[PDB]
Design an enzyme around this catalytic site. Structure first.
Site, mmCIF file in Angstrom:
data_model
loop_
_atom_site.group_PDB
_atom_site.id
_atom_site.type_symbol
_atom_site.label_atom_id
_atom_site.label_comp_id
_atom_site.label_asym_id
_atom_site.label_seq_id
_atom_site.Cartn_x
_atom_site.Cartn_y
_atom_site.Cartn_z
ATOM 1 N N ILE A 17 47.224 -28.215 42.165
ATOM 2 C CA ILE A 17 48.382 -27.366 42.447
ATOM 3 C C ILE A 17 49.416 -27.344 41.318
ATOM 4 O O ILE A 17 50.256 -26.451 41.266
ATOM 5 C CB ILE A 17 49.104 -27.804 43.753
ATOM 6 C CG1 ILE A 17 49.657 -29.224 43.604
ATOM 7 C CG2 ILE A 17 48.150 -27.728 44.934
ATOM 8 C CD1 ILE A 17 50.566 -29.656 44.736
ATOM 9 N N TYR A 18 49.320 -28.291 40.388
ATOM 10 C CA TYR A 18 50.465 -28.655 39.554
ATOM 11 C C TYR A 18 50.724 -27.791 38.323
ATOM 12 O O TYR A 18 51.829 -27.798 37.774
ATOM 13 C CB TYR A 18 50.352 -30.118 39.134
ATOM 14 C CG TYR A 18 50.332 -31.066 40.306
ATOM 15 C CD1 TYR A 18 49.136 -31.616 40.757
ATOM 16 C CD2 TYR A 18 51.508 -31.397 40.976
ATOM 17 C CE1 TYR A 18 49.108 -32.485 41.845
ATOM 18 C CE2 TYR A 18 51.493 -32.257 42.070
ATOM 19 C CZ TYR A 18 50.289 -32.800 42.496
ATOM 20 O OH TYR A 18 50.267 -33.656 43.571
ATOM 21 N N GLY A 19 49.708 -27.061 37.884
ATOM 22 C CA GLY A 19 49.847 -26.242 36.697
ATOM 23 C C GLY A 19 48.497 -25.866 36.127
ATOM 24 O O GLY A 19 47.492 -25.847 36.847
#
Ligand code: F43
Ligand SMILES: C[C@@H](OP(=O)(O)O)[C@H](NC(=O)CCCCCCS)C(=O)O
Ligand SMILES: C[C@@H](OP(=O)(O)O)[C@H](NC(=O)CCCCCCS)C(=O)O
Ligand SMILES: O=S(=O)(O)CCS
Lengths: 568, 247, 433, 432
Positions: C363-365
């Site tokens: 989800i983070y990048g």
């Protein structure tokens, strides 16, 4: 216009001819050139007395010197009269100190509401689910997703076991709503999540918005104020993306961490993200969603007056007020400097109805000379030219200067040349924008005002006030790379504008004026206009000036406070 | 051989502006060297000028054509500190306006660093050079000492209503009307002087209105000086056009 | 000294006995030509300008300026526009300025003369002069009133200079803007993998070859190929990037039918032993052989080739780009466990691959493999040995990605993909074009 | 076809009938040589490295790593270090790499071969390869244990890569790092005024000349000299920067003894009328003559010359750098009021000067004239016509500044001032 002129005179009477606190200004004519100065010091003002007492007690308590008006060179503040300000368009009479952003929760919350907000498209995310997973996206799955999202977004768990979470009482201002140019989908969205474009906007304005964005769907995300305050603007899009990703994982039963999730990430963080503002260069280094990146068009669209008013001058003036507060008091007056800062550089443009008086005079002048060109309409506007700008801007500036000269109270009110320059040029620029529907014709009027002002009084603003104003006229219609730009797209990082007070709020009003005169739904970005068309936000973006007054009288409730976890 | 014209306009205000710019200013009063030094507050009256670096003749200079062709002022030659004189001028028809004090300094004095603001105007220069400029500003019609004040800090007053005796408000009360004459008994940063300085009798409101370089609707209106408004319009038009395309 | 034989993407010999020093960005004329052309060239979307002018949609996502519409036939006048743009971009009559109409007039290639790069500190003159030339040409051709000049300007330049880039403009190049550099010497590393794959016409080995040229040109500008490190990086460039001795091609071919990341390791170790590059150092009680590298930079080049070979085999088998992140991780991880020798870049390809896997599956990048580049915070870490595999992986994808080559790099492929040295970089370096 | 005669800093004719187009950064070999040398060169402070190694003071203000001291005689081995650094910096044997010992071994000039710039996207290879060469050389020469390698590295590189620059390192160039650019094409504008004055050896006109070369090279890279704007910028470069037709020199000379900002305006307007560049458009009732510019780019160049001439006269008289901010403002402001014509850059020199004055006399930022540059937020706005004056002003200062040339640019002046084309740029561009 007569009503506004009467309001201006009443403001001068309240400010100068009846006592405020103990300043003994118990009478007087507001056209009188002379006055008696009583040398009372700060004690004439009840807020100052309160501050002195607090400063003394805190210094004693903490064991190191603090607020002490006697540290002022020569004499303490208030050797002439300390007098109040009336928020323009209102009867809210303010303690001057209560309009410093530090002392005003309404002002701080307006910035937090902008800083903690971003807009993220849904269509790319939905296409990702369809293509990579073969998922069917329906109104049902979207509504379920949105309920999951409004649990997750404030900082709560949807997938893992043994998670800690933010306390709901601390993050109650955090939520996500959606809007869509697809009417069929809007009819199917659970109304608790919906910003209804057809409901919130007039039929003409809704049509412009929907034609602009097409059949696309968007999330208006507002992350917790307490988080925004702990961190920064660049936090916002990351925070939104994390919880959008978690909610898609949960709501659509994806693998909690597969390759398709990375596409949702890139969509949320980059490809379908709309920030309030973009990053700034090294000398004033800041990430996205800081005041310097906020374009004048974007502020004009965050402000909601265009949606609720049919008065094009009123719409422009509210944007001027919001901009002068944000850009000068918080941005230039704190972010880019600090200290006592620039409260009254800004208040000159949203108090005592002086700018409003000049502006409404211009509207009547324009309507009279140019067949009602300043009334709302797209086909009743005057073609932008040097001739029209010279006519309107010169008339505007001459009237404003004459008003300062016929009312010595107004001149003492706006005691700094910069304040008068902001007022005169804002009126002239807004006027030119109203008449032409061309924001850069508005900029030309702004700069011509400055030039006339300078020759009229043999003075203008502070030492470096007119860096941009002498570069101004020539850079209005330049198409050189780092010179050319429509005012709607200009902002605090437009090179000429990057430093100085007394301008940025005016340029925002000039951008808005070009479009409010036309009755346009937005100034540059429909996504922001719809995003902030939402009464759930703590700051009333339809009435920014009045909100500053509510802050001054301590009736504004901000978000993000920590009293829940603070001892007794 | 070009004869300078300085400024447009055909009113008393425009005529006064040309007087200030060209330095053709009527001497109205006298100030002694020691009293001037006293009000400026940079050193004790009659004392030697302090230095920020050695005299040019002592340390020597790079040999380039500019240093050879451009004569150093007496203050530069001596290595004086750069110090200042700063004025606040009332918008109620003080003879001087900030930009036109700066034009006065730039046109008529060598090696000056003038700054214009709405409530203050300053000339920075090598101390002895600055004192020459200061003396002319103190003695001539460019200053009325009721409507103006020498203020190096806390300058508030230019836009404030006048006192009923016609003197511009000073937060720090450095100068005032006493027995029909202007007395200054503190220096420009409000440190009390050993001896008060008589800055002479103030102009009447009538004389100030005749000598002023400021336009006002109730004296000489800016709107009524068509040449100056046209000058602004021409500068505006040309700047705008040439920014698009310099042709 | 070291020599290699250079083979093309189809395993054919191009040139024998090539000294690896002649392959240095600092010495090689072909590589310098690729760098110069990359620096001096931009694409302009004429169709985009025309649409922006008409709708007022300019300056970034969601932006529209209402009531300022200009109806100019940009595309219908593409040839005349190209002519006039060349006149404004050129410095000397008959110089190396090149302005070409592409896609039936929907876009232009604008190549500034080398003189603008020679007289410049970096590469942005290609963008600013290109945009200035287009802006001036449109202003003149369509008789724009001065009060409409801002609209014409921003149709081209977008939100510049409020933004640091031409956000919502219609000018792009292969590179970014210098201020996006994470480090010093990183400009040529800021090229997204989708761009390289687009330019290569989805040719896997030419994609990794071009990427290697850019990456190693970056490592050289970073000062990471000084002294002994020059041989180190050039062995990597020669073997991984330019298919030295047909090792890359041969390893892929013998593992192509039924091979895996694991069997590529067998190929790599077998060949390294046959070449005398590694030897058994000591045998443990179990019988496990701990190897030693007799030539450490050469072993590293072997691991570099194996990393790309495994990518071509694993991403090739799945026709899926995402396999590259785990391939780079596990080829090197398993290679170390097989040999007792350090993986490519002594852990840094594996390390890059760990974070790259995470940031292409979380989800983070990050995103899909195509959004990454040598300047990306996730994939900068290896000294040029990781990103070439990513470009090859993207080239091999059959259509699993949301952010595909077409999505991010359609204009770049259309405008730059027909430049011979860009599409066939190995042949360019071997001087056989 | 606009031609000029180029005169040097002492008003002597260098070259006649020079087409201004040949002075373009994009065509001029001398200017391109200055740009290449600026790009490929750095200074390394050997005494600084030695001190940092011994004390642990590396990586930024206040920094010290205790207990890790290395006592290497860097300066005493300066010649051997220079030799080994050249071997590492060079690309081919006998190429244009130049590594020179400066100040008795206290510093090095490291000029990378132009091949590193040719193969690079920008100019940072000079810094990274220079720093790498020095780091490797020290590691070898003094036999550093691997576990002490981080100390030797940061003695040279400072806090890089935790910081974006070599903060608290010992490598400097004339340029900054690319990420510090405000705009696109701004790298050659990010050159501190004190650097240029240092390099010029405090020669005012050679300082403004070199600054003009950098500034216009920037404007060209910005795409601000395309089409009609090329002639526009080149007239400015020729006349303001390179003393075309001795106009700059002559105006300064005739105002040098008793002149002011005001008298320079008389010189400028008289000469502009004599040359036929401007003429009376209309005479008002008061007798005031409104002028018109017959050649607008040439009038701009006249105003550009006047702005610099006024700086040389006013800063020259005061021997004080600070006078430049007001000079640029009031020369152009008063010129407009004298003529009815726009000042230099159509207001943008005056505008730049308004903020420049403010930010050299206030609490908010900036500093003395010497800290400013064409990439500075305060002084970027004019198209190359302001910063050259700032460089000249700094060169003329006799010692009034806290942040003097020596303070900020001592190493740069010592390492770069000996380069002929840099110290005598007008002669370089003219072809001597
Ligand atoms: C010390 C400086 C120099 C500088 O760089 N900034 C100052 C001071 C600074 C301080 C003053 C606070 C204090 O008193 O301690 C602050 C508040 C910035 C800060 N550090 O927080 C400020 N100016 Ni200033 N400053 C202002 C103004 C002005 C106007 C005031 C003219 C008059 O006649 O009173 C003049 C410039 C001009 O003449 O145009 C001015 C000058 C100055 N400004 C002169 C001091 C002049 C004096 O000696 O009195 N300010 C204004 O004109 C209105 C806005 C006002 C600011 C505070 C607010 O916005 O509420 C304040 C904004
Ligand atoms: C990779 C990069 O993301 P982008 O690829 O640019 O979208 C980066 N994120 C992060 O590194 C987030 C790190 C903290 C969350 C993961 C912790 S293991 C950033 O937002 O700048
Ligand atoms: C000039 C620059 O300062 P420096 O010269 O870099 O120190 C800049 N300050 C500002 O522009 C401050 C502006 C707000 C205060 C003055 C308002 S008129 C900044 O801090 O980045
Ligand atoms: O006095 S200055 O103009 O420098 C600052 C005004 S707040």
């Amino acid at each position: 216009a007569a009503d506004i002129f009467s309001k201006f005179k009443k403001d001068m009477e309240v400010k100068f001819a009846q006592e405020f606190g103990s300043n003994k200004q118990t009478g007087g004519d507001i056209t009188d050139k002379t006055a008696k100065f009583l040398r009372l010091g700060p004690e004439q003002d009840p807020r100052k007395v309160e501050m002195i007492k607090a400063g003394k007690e805190i210094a004693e308590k903490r064991g190191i010197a603090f607020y002490n008006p006697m540290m002022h060179s020569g004499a303490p503040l208030g050797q002439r009269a300390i007098t109040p300000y009336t928020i323009s368009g209102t009867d809210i009479v303010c303690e001057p100190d209560d309009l410093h952003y530090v002392n005003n929760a309404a002002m701080q919350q307006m910035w937090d509401d902008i800083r903690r907000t971003c807009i993220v498209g849904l269509d790319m995310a939905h296409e990702t689910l369809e293509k990579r997973l073969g998922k069917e996206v329906t109104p049902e799955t979207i509504n379920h997703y949105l309920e999951v999202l409004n649990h997750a977004m404030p900082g709560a768990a949807v997938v893992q076991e043994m998670m800690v979470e933010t306390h709901p009482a601390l993050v109650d201002d955090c939520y996500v709503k959606v809007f869509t140019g697809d009417d069929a989908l809007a009819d199917e969205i659970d109304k608790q999540f919906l910003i209804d474009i057809n409901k919130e906007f007039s039929e003409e304005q809704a049509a412009q918005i929907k034609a602009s964005i097409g059949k696309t769907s968007w999330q208006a995300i507002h992350i917790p104020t307490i988080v925004s305050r702990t961190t920064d603007g660049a936090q916002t899009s990351r925070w939104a993306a994390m919880q959008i990703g978690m909610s898609f994982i949960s709501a659509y039963a994806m693998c909690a961490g597969e390759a398709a999730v990375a596409d949702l990430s890139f969509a949320a963080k980059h490809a379908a993200l709309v920030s309030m503002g973009e990053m700034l260069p090294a000398r004033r280094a800041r990430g996205p969603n800081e005041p310097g990146g906020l374009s004048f068009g974007h502020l004009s669209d965050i402000v909601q007056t265009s949606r609720v008013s049919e008065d094009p001058a009123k719409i422009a003036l509210e944007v001027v007020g919001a901009g002068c507060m944000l850009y000068d008091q918080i941005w230039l007056g704190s972010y880019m400097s600090g200290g006592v800062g620039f409260t009254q550089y800004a208040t000159a443009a949203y108090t005592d109805d002086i700018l409003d008086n000049n502006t409404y005079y211009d509207v009547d002048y324009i309507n009279d000379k140019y067949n009602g060109a300043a009334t709302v309409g797209k086909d009743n506007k005057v073609k932008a030219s040097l001739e029209v700008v010279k006519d309107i801007a010169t008339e505007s500036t001459l009237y404003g200067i004459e008003t300062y000269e016929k009312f010595p109270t107004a001149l003492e009110d706006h005691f700094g040349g910069s304040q008068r320059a902001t007022v005169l040029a804002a009126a002239a620029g807004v006027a030119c924008s109203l008449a032409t529907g061309n924001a850069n014709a508005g900029l030309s009027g702004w700069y011509l005002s400055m030039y006339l002002h300078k020759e009229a009084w043999g003075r203008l603003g502070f030492f470096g006030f007119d860096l941009q104003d002498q570069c101004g006229a020539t850079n209005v219609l330049s198409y050189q790379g780092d010179e050319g730009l429509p005012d709607e797209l200009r902002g605090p990082n437009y090179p000429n504008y990057a430093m100085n007070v007394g301008h940025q709020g005016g340029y925002a009003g000039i951008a808005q004026a070009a479009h409010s005169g036309r009755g346009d739904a937005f100034t540059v970005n429909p996504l922001l206009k719809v995003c902030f068309a939402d009464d759930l936000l703590p700051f009333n973006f339809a009435e920014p000036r009045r909100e500053f007054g509510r802050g001054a009288i301590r009736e504004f409730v901000p978000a993000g406070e920590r009293s829940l976890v603070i001892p007794a | 051989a070009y004869e300078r014209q300085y400024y447009p306009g055909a009113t008393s205000v425009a005529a006064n502006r040309r007087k200030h710019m060209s330095g053709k200013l009527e001497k109205l009063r006298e100030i002694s060297d020691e009293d001037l030094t006293a009000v400026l507050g940079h050193r004790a009256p009659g004392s030697d000028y302090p230095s920020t670096h050695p005299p040019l003749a002592e340390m020597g200079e790079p040999a380039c054509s500019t240093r050879e062709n451009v004569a150093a002022t007496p203050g530069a030659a001596a290595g004086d500190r750069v110090r200042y004189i700063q004025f606040a001028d009332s918008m109620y028809n003080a003879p001087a306006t900030p930009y036109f004090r700066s034009y006065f300094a730039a046109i008529n004095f060598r090696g000056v660093d003038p700054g214009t603001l709405s409530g203050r105007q300053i000339v920075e220069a090598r101390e002895r050079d600055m004192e020459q400029c200061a003396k002319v500003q103190m003695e001539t019609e460019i200053t009325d000492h009721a409507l103006a004040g020498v203020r190096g800090a806390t300058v508030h007053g230019h836009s404030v209503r006048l006192q009923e005796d016609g003197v511009m408000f000073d937060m720090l009360d450095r100068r005032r009307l006493e027995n029909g004459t202007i007395i200054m008994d503190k220096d420009q940063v409000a440190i009390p002087l050993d001896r008060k300085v008589d800055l002479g009798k103030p102009m009447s409101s009538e004389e100030a209105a005749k000598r002023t370089t400021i336009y006002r609707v109730d004296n000489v209106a800016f709107r009524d000086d068509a040449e100056v408004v046209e000058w602004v319009h021409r500068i505006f038009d040309q700047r705008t056009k040439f920014g698009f395309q310099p042709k | 000294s070291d020599t290699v034989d250079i083979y093309d993407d189809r395993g054919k010999l191009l040139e024998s006995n090539v000294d690896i020093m002649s392959l240095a960005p600092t010495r090689n004329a072909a590589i310098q030509s690729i760098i110069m052309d990359t620096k001096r060239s931009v694409a302009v979307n004429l169709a985009g300008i025309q649409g922006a002018l008409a709708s007022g949609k300019m300056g970034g996502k969601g932006r529209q300026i209402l009531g300022r519409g200009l109806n100019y036939d940009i595309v219908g006048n593409a040839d005349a526009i190209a002519e006039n743009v060349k006149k404004l971009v050129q410095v000397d009559e008959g110089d190396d300025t090149n302005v070409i109409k592409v896609k039936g007039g929907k876009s232009l290639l604008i190549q500034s003369p080398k003189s603008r790069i020679i007289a410049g500190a970096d590469f942005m003159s290609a963008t600013t002069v290109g945009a200035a030339a287009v802006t001036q040409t449109i202003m003149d051709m369509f008789g724009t009133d001065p009060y409409d000049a801002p609209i014409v300007k921003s149709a081209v330049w977008g939100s510049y200079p409020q933004t640091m880039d031409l956000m919502g403009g219609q000018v792009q190049g292969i590179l970014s803007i210098p201020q996006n550099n994470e480090g010093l010497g990183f400009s040529l590393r800021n090229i997204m993998a989708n761009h390289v794959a687009a330019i290569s016409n989805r040719n896997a080995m030419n994609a990794s070859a071009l990427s290697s040229i850019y990456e190693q040109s970056g490592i050289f500008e970073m000062g990471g190929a000084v002294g002994m490190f020059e041989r180190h990086q050039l062995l990597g460039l020669a073997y991984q990037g330019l298919n030295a001795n047909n090792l890359l091609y041969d390893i892929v071919k013998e593992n192509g039918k039924d091979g895996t990341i694991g069997t590529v390791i067998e190929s790599v170790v077998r060949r390294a032993i046959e070449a005398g590059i590694i030897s058994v150092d000591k045998t443990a009680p179990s019988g496990y052989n701990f190897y030693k590298a007799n030539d450490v930079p050469k072993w590293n080049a072997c691991a570099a080739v194996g990393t790309l070979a495994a990518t071509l085999v694993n991403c090739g088998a799945g026709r899926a780009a995402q396999n590259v992140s785990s391939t780079l991780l596990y080829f090197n991880d398993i290679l170390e466990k097989e040999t007792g020798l350090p993986g490519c870049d002594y852990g840094k390809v594996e390390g890059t691959a760990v974070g790259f896997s995470f940031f292409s599956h979380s989800i983070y990048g990050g995103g899909g493999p195509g959004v990454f580049n040598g300047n990306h915070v996730v994939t900068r870490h290896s000294r040029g040995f990781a990103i070439p595999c990513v470009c090859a992986a993207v080239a091999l994808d059959a259509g699993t990605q949301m952010f595909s080559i077409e999505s991010t790099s359609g204009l770049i492929g259309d405008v730059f993909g027909a430049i011979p040295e860009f599409r066939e970089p190995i042949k360019a370096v071997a001087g056989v074009l």
